[PDB]
Amino acid sequence: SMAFKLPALPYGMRELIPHISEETLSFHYGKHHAGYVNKLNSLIKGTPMESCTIEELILGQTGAVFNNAAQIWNHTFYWNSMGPNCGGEPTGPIRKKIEEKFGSFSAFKTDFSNLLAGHFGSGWGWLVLKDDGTADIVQTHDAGSPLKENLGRPLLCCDVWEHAYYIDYKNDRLSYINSWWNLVNWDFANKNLEAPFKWS
Amino acid sequence: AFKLPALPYGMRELIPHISEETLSFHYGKHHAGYVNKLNSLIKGTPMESCTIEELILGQTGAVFNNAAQIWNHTFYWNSMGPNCGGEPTGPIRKKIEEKFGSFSAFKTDFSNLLAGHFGSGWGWLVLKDDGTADIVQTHDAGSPLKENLGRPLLCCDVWEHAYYIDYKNDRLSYINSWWNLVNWDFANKNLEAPFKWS
Ligand SMILES: [Fe+3]
Ligand SMILES: [Fe+3]
Numbered sequence: 001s002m003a004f005k006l007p008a009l010p011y012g013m014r015e016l017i018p019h020i021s022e023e024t025l026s027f028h029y030g031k032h033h034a035g036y037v038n039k040l041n042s043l044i045k046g047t048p049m050e051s052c053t054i055e056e057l058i059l060g061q062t063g064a065v066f067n068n069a070a071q072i073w074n075h076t077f078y079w080n081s082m083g084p085n086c087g088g089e090p091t092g093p094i095r096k097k098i099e100e101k102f103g104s105f106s107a108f109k110t111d112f113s114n115l116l117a118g119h120f121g122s123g124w125g126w127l128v129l130k131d132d133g134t135a136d137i138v139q140t141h142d143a144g145s146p147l148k149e150n151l152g153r154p155l156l157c158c159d160v161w162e163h164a165y166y167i168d169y170k171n172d173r174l175s176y177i178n179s180w181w182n183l184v185n186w187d188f189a190n191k192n193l194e195a196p197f198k199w200s
Numbered sequence: 201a202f203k204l205p206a207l208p209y210g211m212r213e214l215i216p217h218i219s220e221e222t223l224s225f226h227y228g229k230h231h232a233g234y235v236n237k238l239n240s241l242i243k244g245t246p247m248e249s250c251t252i253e254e255l256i257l258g259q260t261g262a263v264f265n266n267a268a269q270i271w272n273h274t275f276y277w278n279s280m281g282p283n284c285g286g287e288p289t290g291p292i293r294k295k296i297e298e299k300f301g302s303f304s305a306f307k308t309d310f311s312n313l314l315a316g317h318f319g320s321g322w323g324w325l326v327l328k329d330d331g332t333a334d335i336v337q338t339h340d341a342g343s344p345l346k347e348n349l350g351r352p353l354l355c356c357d358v359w360e361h362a363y364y365i366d367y368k369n370d371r372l373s374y375i376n377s378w379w380n381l382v383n384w385d386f387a388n389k390n391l392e393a394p395f396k397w398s
Contacts, residue, residue, distance in 0.1 A: 121339075
Protein backbone atom coordinates (compact mmCIF):
# COMPACT_ATOMS: atom_id res chain seq x y z
CA SER A 1 0.00 0.00 0.00
CA MET A 2 1.16 3.52 -0.86
CA ALA A 3 -1.23 5.02 1.68
CA PHE A 4 -0.09 7.66 4.14
CA LYS A 5 0.15 6.40 7.70
CA LEU A 6 -0.55 8.38 10.85
CA PRO A 7 2.69 8.74 12.82
CA ALA A 8 2.47 7.48 16.42
CA LEU A 9 1.72 9.97 19.18
CA PRO A 10 5.05 10.62 21.02
CA TYR A 11 3.42 9.75 24.38
CA GLY A 12 0.40 7.96 25.83
CA MET A 13 -2.94 9.75 25.92
CA ARG A 14 -2.80 10.45 29.69
CA GLU A 15 0.70 11.94 29.74
CA LEU A 16 -0.24 15.61 29.18
CA ILE A 17 -2.56 15.72 32.23
CA PRO A 18 -3.55 18.12 33.84
CA HIS A 19 -2.75 20.47 30.97
CA ILE A 20 -4.45 18.58 28.13
CA SER A 21 -6.78 15.73 29.05
CA GLU A 22 -6.99 12.13 28.00
CA GLU A 23 -10.31 12.86 26.38
CA THR A 24 -8.82 15.67 24.32
CA LEU A 25 -5.94 13.53 23.04
CA SER A 26 -8.39 10.69 22.34
CA PHE A 27 -10.43 12.90 20.02
CA HIS A 28 -7.78 15.30 18.74
CA TYR A 29 -5.36 12.54 17.73
CA GLY A 30 -7.74 9.59 17.49
CA LYS A 31 -10.49 11.28 15.50
CA HIS A 32 -9.32 14.55 13.94
CA HIS A 33 -5.70 13.70 13.05
CA ALA A 34 -6.59 10.12 12.08
CA GLY A 35 -9.42 11.62 10.04
CA TYR A 36 -7.11 13.86 8.01
CA VAL A 37 -4.98 10.85 7.07
CA ASN A 38 -7.98 8.78 6.04
CA LYS A 39 -9.44 11.65 4.01
CA LEU A 40 -6.17 12.42 2.23
CA ASN A 41 -5.79 8.76 1.27
CA SER A 42 -9.36 8.70 -0.01
CA LEU A 43 -8.67 11.79 -2.15
CA ILE A 44 -5.42 10.63 -3.76
CA LYS A 45 -6.01 6.86 -4.09
CA GLY A 46 -5.46 5.79 -7.68
CA THR A 47 -4.25 9.23 -8.73
CA PRO A 48 -0.74 10.28 -9.71
CA MET A 49 -0.55 12.13 -6.37
CA GLU A 50 -0.35 8.74 -4.66
CA SER A 51 3.46 8.75 -4.72
CA CYS A 52 3.99 12.35 -3.57
CA THR A 53 5.55 13.16 -0.21
CA ILE A 54 3.37 15.08 2.21
CA GLU A 55 5.56 18.16 1.70
CA GLU A 56 5.17 17.84 -2.07
CA LEU A 57 1.37 17.83 -1.69
CA ILE A 58 1.50 20.83 0.63
CA LEU A 59 3.64 22.79 -1.84
CA GLY A 60 1.95 21.63 -5.03
CA GLN A 61 -1.76 21.08 -4.40
CA THR A 62 -4.76 23.21 -3.51
CA GLY A 63 -8.24 22.56 -2.13
CA ALA A 64 -9.17 19.51 -0.08
CA VAL A 65 -5.90 17.70 -0.90
CA PHE A 66 -3.92 20.66 0.44
CA ASN A 67 -6.16 21.07 3.48
CA ASN A 68 -5.81 17.48 4.55
CA ALA A 69 -2.07 17.12 3.74
CA ALA A 70 -1.27 20.34 5.59
CA GLN A 71 -3.34 19.38 8.62
CA ILE A 72 -1.61 15.99 8.76
CA TRP A 73 1.76 17.78 8.84
CA ASN A 74 0.65 20.51 11.24
CA HIS A 75 -0.74 18.05 13.78
CA THR A 76 2.35 15.81 13.76
CA PHE A 77 4.42 18.97 14.35
CA TYR A 78 2.04 19.97 17.16
CA TRP A 79 2.34 16.67 19.07
CA ASN A 80 6.13 16.90 18.89
CA SER A 81 6.07 20.53 20.09
CA MET A 82 4.68 19.23 23.39
CA GLY A 83 5.50 16.54 25.87
CA PRO A 84 5.31 15.27 29.42
CA ASN A 85 8.09 16.52 31.67
CA CYS A 86 8.72 19.58 29.46
CA GLY A 87 7.61 23.22 29.70
CA GLY A 88 9.41 25.76 31.88
CA GLU A 89 12.23 27.99 30.63
CA PRO A 90 13.84 27.37 27.23
CA THR A 91 17.28 25.72 27.32
CA GLY A 92 20.06 25.41 24.74
CA PRO A 93 20.22 27.12 21.34
CA ILE A 94 16.52 28.06 21.31
CA ARG A 95 16.98 30.07 24.52
CA LYS A 96 19.63 32.21 22.80
CA LYS A 97 17.45 32.74 19.71
CA ILE A 98 14.48 33.76 21.88
CA GLU A 99 16.56 36.23 23.88
CA GLU A 100 18.12 37.68 20.71
CA LYS A 101 14.67 38.41 19.24
CA PHE A 102 12.47 39.15 22.26
CA GLY A 103 14.97 40.17 24.95
CA SER A 104 13.72 37.57 27.41
CA PHE A 105 11.63 34.44 27.68
CA SER A 106 8.91 36.41 29.45
CA ALA A 107 8.59 38.84 26.50
CA PHE A 108 8.36 35.89 24.09
CA LYS A 109 5.68 34.29 26.26
CA THR A 110 3.71 37.57 26.24
CA ASP A 111 3.99 38.09 22.47
CA PHE A 112 3.26 34.49 21.50
CA SER A 113 0.37 34.18 23.98
CA ASN A 114 -1.15 37.35 22.53
CA LEU A 115 -0.75 36.00 18.99
CA LEU A 116 -2.39 32.70 19.93
CA ALA A 117 -5.19 34.43 21.85
CA GLY A 118 -5.81 36.91 19.05
CA HIS A 119 -6.30 34.54 16.15
CA PHE A 120 -9.88 34.77 14.87
CA GLY A 121 -11.48 31.51 13.75
CA SER A 122 -9.49 28.32 13.19
CA GLY A 123 -5.71 28.40 12.93
CA TRP A 124 -2.16 27.96 14.23
CA GLY A 125 0.61 29.90 15.95
CA TRP A 126 4.25 29.17 15.00
CA LEU A 127 7.68 29.94 16.32
CA VAL A 128 9.90 29.98 13.20
CA LEU A 129 13.52 30.47 12.16
CA LYS A 130 13.64 33.12 9.43
CA ASP A 131 16.09 33.11 6.52
CA ASP A 132 18.18 35.80 8.20
CA GLY A 133 18.74 33.37 11.07
CA THR A 134 16.56 35.12 13.63
CA ALA A 135 13.51 33.71 15.40
CA ASP A 136 10.02 35.09 14.91
CA ILE A 137 6.36 34.30 15.53
CA VAL A 138 3.76 33.96 12.79
CA GLN A 139 0.22 32.69 12.47
CA THR A 140 -1.57 30.69 9.81
CA HIS A 141 -5.30 30.30 9.24
CA ASP A 142 -7.26 27.05 8.87
CA ALA A 143 -4.79 24.51 7.41
CA GLY A 144 -2.30 27.23 6.47
CA SER A 145 1.29 26.06 6.30
CA PRO A 146 4.54 27.98 7.00
CA LEU A 147 6.02 25.68 4.33
CA LYS A 148 3.58 26.73 1.61
CA GLU A 149 3.57 30.38 2.70
CA ASN A 150 7.38 30.43 3.09
CA LEU A 151 7.16 32.03 6.55
CA GLY A 152 10.33 30.44 7.88
CA ARG A 153 11.44 27.09 9.30
CA PRO A 154 8.94 25.83 11.88
CA LEU A 155 10.41 25.33 15.35
CA LEU A 156 7.24 24.95 17.50
CA CYS A 157 3.50 25.31 16.98
CA CYS A 158 0.31 25.57 18.97
CA ASP A 159 -3.07 24.57 17.51
CA VAL A 160 -5.87 27.08 18.24
CA TRP A 161 -8.68 25.32 16.37
CA GLU A 162 -11.46 25.05 18.95
CA HIS A 163 -11.25 21.24 19.01
CA ALA A 164 -7.74 21.58 20.48
CA TYR A 165 -9.13 22.95 23.72
CA TYR A 166 -12.93 22.91 23.88
CA ILE A 167 -13.25 19.68 25.87
CA ASP A 168 -10.98 20.98 28.63
CA TYR A 169 -11.41 24.75 28.53
CA LYS A 170 -14.56 25.43 26.47
CA ASN A 171 -14.39 29.06 25.25
CA ASP A 172 -11.45 29.90 27.52
CA ARG A 173 -8.61 29.75 24.99
CA LEU A 174 -6.43 31.87 27.27
CA SER A 175 -6.41 29.13 29.94
CA TYR A 176 -5.50 26.58 27.27
CA ILE A 177 -2.62 28.80 26.11
CA ASN A 178 -1.42 29.23 29.71
CA SER A 179 -1.47 25.44 30.12
CA TRP A 180 0.34 24.86 26.81
CA TRP A 181 3.41 26.65 28.20
CA ASN A 182 3.68 23.81 30.72
CA LEU A 183 3.96 21.32 27.87
CA VAL A 184 6.24 23.01 25.37
CA ASN A 185 9.03 20.70 24.22
CA TRP A 186 12.18 22.82 23.87
CA ASP A 187 14.12 19.77 22.70
CA PHE A 188 11.96 19.65 19.56
CA ALA A 189 12.70 23.35 18.94
CA ASN A 190 16.42 22.67 19.33
CA LYS A 191 16.26 19.70 16.93
CA ASN A 192 14.49 21.90 14.38
CA LEU A 193 17.23 24.50 14.70
CA GLU A 194 19.74 21.79 13.72
CA ALA A 195 17.70 20.62 10.72
CA PRO A 196 14.18 21.17 9.41
CA PHE A 197 11.65 18.59 10.54
CA LYS A 198 10.84 16.09 7.79
CA TRP A 199 7.49 14.36 8.21
CA SER A 200 7.55 10.55 8.24
CA ALA B 201 -24.36 50.55 23.31
CA PHE B 202 -25.40 47.19 21.85
CA LYS B 203 -27.34 44.72 23.97
CA LEU B 204 -27.46 40.97 23.47
CA PRO B 205 -30.98 40.10 22.28
CA ALA B 206 -32.77 37.50 24.40
CA LEU B 207 -32.82 33.88 23.28
CA PRO B 208 -36.20 33.04 21.69
CA TYR B 209 -36.59 30.07 24.08
CA GLY B 210 -35.39 28.71 27.42
CA MET B 211 -31.96 27.13 27.55
CA ARG B 212 -33.41 23.64 28.13
CA GLU B 213 -35.91 23.85 25.27
CA LEU B 214 -33.67 22.50 22.46
CA ILE B 215 -32.94 19.30 24.40
CA PRO B 216 -32.16 16.61 23.21
CA HIS B 217 -30.89 18.22 19.99
CA ILE B 218 -28.72 20.96 21.53
CA SER B 219 -27.95 20.78 25.25
CA GLU B 220 -28.41 23.30 28.03
CA GLU B 221 -24.63 23.34 28.49
CA THR B 222 -24.12 24.20 24.80
CA LEU B 223 -26.51 27.12 24.94
CA SER B 224 -24.94 28.36 28.19
CA PHE B 225 -21.52 28.66 26.50
CA HIS B 226 -22.58 29.42 22.95
CA TYR B 227 -25.09 32.12 23.90
CA GLY B 228 -23.83 33.10 27.35
CA LYS B 229 -20.10 33.29 26.58
CA HIS B 230 -19.48 33.41 22.81
CA HIS B 231 -22.43 35.52 21.65
CA ALA B 232 -22.31 37.72 24.75
CA GLY B 233 -18.57 38.05 24.16
CA TYR B 234 -19.05 39.46 20.66
CA VAL B 235 -21.42 42.08 22.06
CA ASN B 236 -18.99 43.03 24.83
CA LYS B 237 -16.01 43.17 22.47
CA LEU B 238 -17.84 45.24 19.84
CA ASN B 239 -18.98 47.72 22.49
CA SER B 240 -15.40 48.12 23.73
CA LEU B 241 -14.10 48.58 20.16
CA ILE B 242 -16.53 51.32 19.15
CA LYS B 243 -16.93 53.21 22.45
CA GLY B 244 -15.95 56.87 22.06
CA THR B 245 -15.62 56.57 18.29
CA PRO B 246 -17.86 57.77 15.41
CA MET B 247 -18.92 54.12 14.97
CA GLU B 248 -20.75 54.23 18.32
CA SER B 249 -24.01 55.34 16.67
CA CYS B 250 -23.95 52.90 13.73
CA THR B 251 -26.47 50.10 13.36
CA ILE B 252 -25.16 46.51 13.36
CA GLU B 253 -25.93 46.25 9.66
CA GLU B 254 -24.04 49.49 9.00
CA LEU B 255 -20.97 48.13 10.77
CA ILE B 256 -21.17 44.87 8.82
CA LEU B 257 -21.40 46.73 5.50
CA GLY B 258 -18.86 49.47 6.25
CA GLN B 259 -16.08 48.10 8.48
CA THR B 260 -13.39 45.42 8.32
CA GLY B 261 -11.10 43.72 10.82
CA ALA B 262 -12.16 43.19 14.44
CA VAL B 263 -15.13 45.59 14.29
CA PHE B 264 -16.53 43.64 11.33
CA ASN B 265 -15.84 40.25 12.90
CA ASN B 266 -17.66 41.05 16.11
CA ALA B 267 -20.55 42.93 14.45
CA ALA B 268 -21.12 40.15 11.92
CA GLN B 269 -20.92 37.40 14.55
CA ILE B 270 -23.49 39.26 16.66
CA TRP B 271 -25.89 39.36 13.69
CA ASN B 272 -25.11 35.80 12.57
CA HIS B 273 -25.73 34.34 16.04
CA THR B 274 -29.01 36.18 16.55
CA PHE B 275 -30.07 34.85 13.13
CA TYR B 276 -28.97 31.36 14.18
CA TRP B 277 -31.03 31.31 17.39
CA ASN B 278 -34.10 32.40 15.43
CA SER B 279 -33.48 29.72 12.79
CA MET B 280 -34.17 27.11 15.47
CA GLY B 281 -36.89 26.41 17.96
CA PRO B 282 -38.59 23.84 20.18
CA ASN B 283 -41.50 21.98 18.51
CA CYS B 284 -40.09 22.79 15.08
CA GLY B 285 -38.06 20.73 12.61
CA GLY B 286 -39.69 18.22 10.30
CA GLU B 287 -40.80 18.98 6.75
CA PRO B 288 -40.97 22.60 5.52
CA THR B 289 -44.25 24.49 5.63
CA GLY B 290 -45.66 27.56 3.92
CA PRO B 291 -44.03 29.57 1.14
CA ILE B 292 -40.53 28.23 1.88
CA ARG B 293 -41.77 24.71 1.14
CA LYS B 294 -42.77 25.95 -2.32
CA LYS B 295 -39.41 27.59 -3.02
CA ILE B 296 -37.51 24.55 -1.70
CA GLU B 297 -39.44 22.11 -3.91
CA GLU B 298 -39.01 24.43 -6.91
CA LYS B 299 -35.23 24.70 -6.52
CA PHE B 300 -34.26 21.26 -5.19
CA GLY B 301 -37.15 19.09 -6.39
CA SER B 302 -37.97 17.63 -2.97
CA PHE B 303 -37.26 18.33 0.67
CA SER B 304 -35.21 15.12 0.83
CA ALA B 305 -32.94 16.42 -1.95
CA PHE B 306 -32.63 19.80 -0.21
CA LYS B 307 -31.74 18.12 3.08
CA THR B 308 -28.98 16.12 1.36
CA ASP B 309 -27.60 19.14 -0.50
CA PHE B 310 -27.62 21.49 2.50
CA SER B 311 -26.29 18.77 4.84
CA ASN B 312 -23.41 18.18 2.41
CA LEU B 313 -22.64 21.91 2.29
CA LEU B 314 -22.62 22.11 6.11
CA ALA B 315 -20.56 18.93 6.50
CA GLY B 316 -18.05 20.00 3.88
CA HIS B 317 -17.17 23.44 5.23
CA PHE B 318 -13.51 23.43 6.23
CA GLY B 319 -12.61 25.45 9.32
CA SER B 320 -15.02 27.86 11.05
CA GLY B 321 -18.05 29.11 9.17
CA TRP B 322 -21.78 29.23 8.40
CA GLY B 323 -24.27 27.65 6.02
CA TRP B 324 -27.23 29.67 4.76
CA LEU B 325 -30.52 29.16 3.01
CA VAL B 326 -31.04 32.37 1.02
CA LEU B 327 -33.52 34.08 -1.29
CA LYS B 328 -31.77 35.22 -4.46
CA ASP B 329 -32.70 38.35 -6.41
CA ASP B 330 -34.48 36.23 -9.05
CA GLY B 331 -36.83 35.05 -6.30
CA THR B 332 -35.42 31.52 -6.10
CA ALA B 333 -34.03 29.75 -3.04
CA ASP B 334 -30.41 28.69 -2.86
CA ILE B 335 -27.79 27.56 -0.37
CA VAL B 336 -24.48 29.32 0.25
CA GLN B 337 -21.68 29.28 2.80
CA THR B 338 -19.61 31.95 4.51
CA HIS B 339 -16.30 31.55 6.31
CA ASP B 340 -15.40 32.73 9.84
CA ALA B 341 -17.64 35.80 10.45
CA GLY B 342 -18.53 36.17 6.76
CA SER B 343 -21.94 37.71 6.13
CA PRO B 344 -24.35 37.09 3.22
CA LEU B 345 -25.25 40.77 3.61
CA LYS B 346 -21.68 41.96 2.97
CA GLU B 347 -20.96 39.39 0.23
CA ASN B 348 -24.35 39.97 -1.48
CA LEU B 349 -25.22 36.27 -1.51
CA GLY B 350 -28.96 36.85 -1.22
CA ARG B 351 -31.41 37.48 1.59
CA PRO B 352 -30.76 35.19 4.57
CA LEU B 353 -33.66 32.87 5.39
CA LEU B 354 -32.05 30.34 7.76
CA CYS B 355 -28.55 29.60 8.96
CA CYS B 356 -26.59 26.85 10.67
CA ASP B 357 -23.40 27.63 12.62
CA VAL B 358 -20.61 25.12 11.96
CA TRP B 359 -17.94 26.71 14.10
CA GLU B 360 -16.75 23.87 16.31
CA HIS B 361 -18.03 25.56 19.48
CA ALA B 362 -21.59 25.16 18.12
CA TYR B 363 -21.41 21.41 18.52
CA TYR B 364 -18.27 20.22 20.28
CA ILE B 365 -19.82 19.88 23.75
CA ASP B 366 -22.58 17.62 22.49
CA TYR B 367 -21.08 15.90 19.44
CA LYS B 368 -17.30 16.41 19.62
CA ASN B 369 -15.83 15.82 16.14
CA ASP B 370 -19.13 14.42 14.80
CA ARG B 371 -20.46 17.43 12.88
CA LEU B 372 -22.73 15.15 10.84
CA SER B 373 -24.70 14.17 13.97
CA TYR B 374 -24.97 17.82 14.93
CA ILE B 375 -26.29 18.64 11.45
CA ASN B 376 -28.87 15.88 11.69
CA SER B 377 -29.97 17.28 15.06
CA TRP B 378 -30.19 20.77 13.58
CA TRP B 379 -32.82 19.48 11.14
CA ASN B 380 -34.95 18.51 14.15
CA LEU B 381 -34.81 22.15 15.27
CA VAL B 382 -35.18 24.14 12.05
CA ASN B 383 -37.74 26.91 12.44
CA TRP B 384 -39.63 27.12 9.16
CA ASP B 385 -41.76 29.97 10.56
CA PHE B 386 -38.62 32.16 10.69
CA ALA B 387 -37.77 31.30 7.07
CA ASN B 388 -41.27 32.29 6.01
CA LYS B 389 -41.06 35.57 7.95
CA ASN B 390 -37.79 36.33 6.16
CA LEU B 391 -39.52 35.66 2.82
CA GLU B 392 -42.08 38.35 3.64
CA ALA B 393 -39.42 40.86 4.70
CA PRO B 394 -35.67 40.70 5.45
CA PHE B 395 -34.68 40.16 9.08
CA LYS B 396 -33.70 43.36 10.86
CA TRP B 397 -31.50 42.89 13.92
CA SER B 398 -32.64 44.34 17.24
FE1 LIG C 1 -6.19 20.31 15.59
FE1 LIG D 1 -21.16 30.29 17.05
